[PDB]
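Handout, page 2. Input:
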Amino acid sequence: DVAPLSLGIETAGGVMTNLIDRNTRIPTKACKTFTTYADNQPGVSIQVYEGERAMTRDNHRLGTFELSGIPPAPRGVPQIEVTFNIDANGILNVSAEDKSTGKSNRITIQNETQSDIDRMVHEAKQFEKEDGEQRERVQARNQLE
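Output:
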């Protein structure tokens, strides 16, 4: 019993950054530290996606929430911990917190076909060269708009 698709958030440039890879046994929990794309950025949008493709526009949006009220700092200085937690029922909670202010927000995604899982992993195998190149286009990591 698993996450049948990779789960992650959109990072600067429409890039898919994973927290949980497909076929990870559940329950499972993962976290990474994200940060700002721009100097003095007031907030970030946490856009939760499901799928195997390099760009989020080729994956499936599960939900979005905002984390606002980030104090002004140079780009890349804020520390925003994003946690994906999937429980034994397959329910996914995505939390974001700003390490310095402790400002927090969360979304609950409901567990709610087998054939189309199969082809999404196939289409991803198809488009692997072009997707790899697509990841080479942004060298920075973990930045959020």
